[PDB]
């Protein structure tokens with residue numbers, strides 16, 4: 001059984017695969033924040049701008065098994081078109097994402113990507129693993145495909161992240177009342193340390209889902 | 210001898226490698242348009258928004274040999290930092306970019322990308338070949354790494370482009386008085402045909418060189 005907040009088909013707004021058509025499956029619930037604004041000030045992760053509470057979003061609901069979830073995901077894809085790709089996010093997807101769901105997605109011809117905070121062990125069979133480390137949280141996933149760090153966070157050892165085993169190293173401006181400020185920072189960082197690339201949240205500029 | 214409009218160090222604004230730190234070497238001159246406004250209305254390529262006339266830009270000038278040009282390019286890179294990468298553009302870089310310049314850059318530890326209109330044969334030794342086919346120009350480069358097509362153009366055969374031998378297929382909204390309009394078109398195209406990804410000119414939103 002799976003608790004999904006919302007399922008929608010759009011272009012990936014951020015990360016190394018920005019611009020790529022994909023179905024986003026946003027799981028409900030996270031392990032680093034309840035989702036309530038009264039808890040944010042003392043949460044482990046306090047800068048989240050995503051609503052992952054409940055199952056009331058678009059195509060959201062409580063799915064009984066993987067095939068029921070895959071059917072909904074596959075249904076959102078343009079008929080007769082290949083290159084099927086799903087992004088598992090939330091929320092923290094590793095709270096619910098299991099192997100039976102992964103096998104069912106691969107069976108449907110879907111490539112699987114995951115956006116995880118890195119505080120939980122991930123499934124190796126996932127095609128693209130994106131880790132976004134939270135500074136005040138433990139990081140148990142020290143290898144993957146891309147490391148997308150949101151800056152700035154206090155207690156952050158940014159240069160130490162480059163020692164990890166990832167193919168892509170990105171910094172992403174923290175959105176909020178200081179987005180433009182943090183963007184300047186991220187750009188300045190990459191230029192000074194060219195190992196890092198900029199991850200822009202393009203979907204917030206293009207105003208797309 | 211090389212005639213270069215401008216050489217500047219920034220983050221790549223568009224394409225498959227958006228956000229990646231790189232030195233941009235903008236060669237002067239093009240073969241599909243003279244650069245004169247008086248010639249635009251009758252040109253093969255009429256939507257160019259780039260100044261490539263002369264050598265009066267930042268770090269621009271006539272470079273006698275490859276070593277002189279490479280020295281300026283390398284000089285823009287952060288001292289002590291690796292991951293050296295140069296994007297050869299213009300203008301049409303294949304009007305000037307030869308093998309000695311490639312070998313000199315490779316000897317300087319630089320990875321080489323190229324932005325070309327595809328009307329001229331390219332050097333195979335170039336690490337990243339990005340082709341942006343113009344609708345009313347011959348396309349002799351039918352293979353490479355990145356096929357970044359600017360839409361919409363009249364007489365364009367968009368679907369046929371996807372048959373070519375490229376790893377990435379991108380559509381990029383034609384900037385101008387209808388950029389927001391073209392962006393919606395591009396987004397719609399990728400969603401209807403998920404082989405294509407969106408190439409957004411991020412540097413025009415982030416306001417960076």
Ligand SMILES: C[S@@+](CC[C@H](N)C(=O)[O-])C[C@H]1O[C@@H](n2cnc3c(N)ncnc32)[C@H](O)[C@@H]1O
Pocket residue numbers: 030047048049050089090091092093115116117118131132148150172173174175176
């Ligand atoms: C909402 S999280 C869901 C996945 C998981 N909980 C995580 O933290 O990776 C999706 C992505 O957006 C990033 N993100 C969250 N809040 C953000 C904010 N205010 N500004 C920028 N990126 C943010 C996260 O770091 C993560 O990379």
Ligand SMILES: C[S@@+](CC[C@H](N)C(=O)[O-])C[C@H]1O[C@@H](n2cnc3c(N)ncnc32)[C@H](O)[C@@H]1O
Pocket residue numbers: 239256257258259298299300301302324325326327340341357359381382383384385
């Ligand atoms: C200025 S061109 C130089 C490289 C080469 N002359 C070419 O056409 O690819 C660099 C890139 O910008 C794109 N471009 C030029 N004018 C544009 C415009 N008005 N809107 C969007 N992209 C544009 C070109 O298609 C190309 O991909």
Ligand SMILES: Nc1nc2ncc(C(=O)O)nc2c(=O)[nH]1
Pocket residue numbers: 010011012013014024050089090115203208209
């Ligand atoms: N376009 C788009 N890309 C996105 N990429 C990632 C995430 C996420 O993991 O939360 N969310 C979005 C989103 O809402 N829209």
Ligand SMILES: Nc1nc2ncc(C(=O)O)nc2c(=O)[nH]1
Pocket residue numbers: 219220221222223259298299324412417418
């Ligand atoms: N940031 C940035 N990226 C760019 N990427 C490509 C091209 C080009 O080939 O013309 N030009 C720019 C530019 O001016 N700025």
Ligand code: SF4
Pocket residue numbers: 030031032033045046047048049050052090091092117134
């Ligand atoms: S870990 Fe991710 S989903 Fe959870 S609160 Fe932080 S940003 Fe939001």
Ligand code: SF4
Pocket residue numbers: 239240241242254255256257258259261299300301326343
């Ligand atoms: S071919 Fe490229 S450089 Fe030449 S006018 Fe067209 S867009 Fe500009």
